Structure formats: structure tokens, C-alpha cells
Amino acid sequence: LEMQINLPEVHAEVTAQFVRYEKALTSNDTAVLNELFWNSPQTLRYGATENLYGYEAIAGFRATRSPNNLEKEIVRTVITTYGHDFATANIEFRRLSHSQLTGRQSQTWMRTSQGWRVVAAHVSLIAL
Amino acid sequence: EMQINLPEVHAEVTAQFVRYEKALTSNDTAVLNELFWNSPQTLRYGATENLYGYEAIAGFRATRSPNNLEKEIVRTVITTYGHDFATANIEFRRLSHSQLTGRQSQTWMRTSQGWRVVAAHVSLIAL
Ligand SMILES: O=C(O)CC(=O)CC(=O)O
Ligand SMILES: O=C(O)CC(=O)CC(=O)O
């Protein structure tokens, strides 16, 4: 894997799915948000204020989340692919409601037979 | 899907995770640096800082205070995918900050020199 860092075609596919994910967040398109998370009990998301274990818990969280005050400005993005089937996506952002905090979002992506999926995610806000 | 938690692979990664946790408590920076992937792509979103590239992470390790190190691990999920990739996610607590619960996420890759962390993210939140 270490011999195949950021193969152009792989990096392009993952970047596309990442943009898809970010677009679905802004429109609260829960169908796409759920589509992009790996459907497995192992999948997990450490959110800004909650820890969710399993796809079912993540999907359930998305159903009960309010689409209000969701906007976020991405400031930095690093997408790295390893071989043909694995990737990480790491971003910094600012959320408009907490202008004094810098946001971090990490995702690990895996290529499944149904396409790229997030297997684990972690979001946090800090003051620098 | 594609070979989830193969016993031998899951055992190797769990061993390296235990190695990492032991090196944190003894502030064994040699082992801490050994376990992070030596690449400019490697990154660590720390509890209080964002570091890009192995050199920035190694530099941070040389200057860090080892004092408030100890922590109770409360949940661990280690998941391996095929033979060469893994994630490790833990929740932890400290008696020194009873109001904060910790999260630590890592993505691991098998290199020719062994398993390495390619990305990590640590954060503390209120209960
Ligand atoms: O607020 C959070 O927990 C993170 C977030 O913006 C939506 C996501 O990336 O799932
Ligand atoms: O104290 C913690 O759990 C987070 C941390 O920075 C140790 C590490 O770098 O793994």
C-alpha cells in the first residue's frame, strides 16, 4: 500500500465521494448520508457531542438531527489514498454558530462492492 | 465485507495498539515515533493542536510534557479490513478531568517495516 500513495484515479474517486458527502450534509440529504456510511455494526462516529457505535446508531442519529444551524466553512482538506481500496479524509472547518472554534473532521474510507464507504469518523471543535 | 477482523490480523493490530498505549504512559518517544507512518501525508489532530506531516508530529513528541498521561480506557473498537488496513477507536476517562470524556481515533496501515498510524484524531468532550 505504501508503494501506491495517491494514485490519481483512486484519489479522484475518493475526492468525488467526499464532495458528495459534504453536499449531502448541507442539504441534509439523509438518504445519501446513510448510503455513504458503511452498513456494519463496526462502523462508528465520534461526533462533536456524541459517540455512536454501529451503522444503525449513526442512521438513527441522522433521522433525529435538526437541519437548522448546519452550515460549515471548509478551510483545509487532505485526502490520501492507499492502494486501490482505502483512504483517509481530514479537514478543518469553521461552523458559523461557534466562530471562535476550529473544527476537525477525520474519516476513513474503504471501497466496497457497492462503492466507497466511511468506516469510521471523528469530529471535534477546539479553540486554538 | 472484504475480510473483516481476520483473527491473526486483528491480533497484530491489537498488539501494536497496546504497544502505543504503553509508550504513551512511559513517554517512550522512540516507540511513539516508530509507530507513526514516516510521510508528509501523516497527520494528527491532537486535543489542542493540529499537526501535518511526520516531522511535525515527531517534533511535538520531543517537546511534550509526559505528566498528565495516565487514563482509563473505557471502550475499544479495533477493526481490520483485509490484511493491511485497520482502524482503532477508543474512549477514555481521567480522574484529573472528571467532567471530560476522551476519544481517540487512529487509522493503521501495514508497511514493510510493520504497522503504522497514518492519521489520528484526539478530542475531549463533556459527558
Ligand atoms: O457535527 C458533527 O458531529 C459532525 C458533522 O458536522 C456532520 C458529519 O460530518 O457527520
Ligand atoms: O492523551 C490522549 O489520549 C491523547 C494523546 O494525545 C495521546 C496520544 O497522542 O495518543
Residue numbers in the entry:
A (entry chain B): 2 to 129
B (entry chain A): 3 to 129
From the reporting publication:
AtzH is the first DUF3225 family protein that has been shown to possess a catabolic function, likely decarboxylating the product of AtzEG-mediated deamination of 1-carboxybiuret as part of the cyanuric acid mineralization pathway. AtzH belongs to NTF2-fold superfamily, which contains 38 protein families, including the AtzH family: DUF3225 (DUF: domain of unknown function).
This may suggest that Tyr22 is the catalytic amino acid residue in AtzH, possibly acting as a proton donor (consistent with the catalytic role of tyrosine in other enzymes), with Arg46 fulfilling a non-critical function As the substrate analog binds between Arg46 and Tyr22, it seems unlikely that Arg46 has a role in activating Tyr22 (noting that the substrate analog may not adopt exactly the same conformation as the bound substrate). As yet its catalytic mechanism is not known, but our results suggest it involves the action of Tyr22 and Arg46, and that these amino acid residues are positioned relative to the substrate in a manner consistent with an acid-base mechanism.
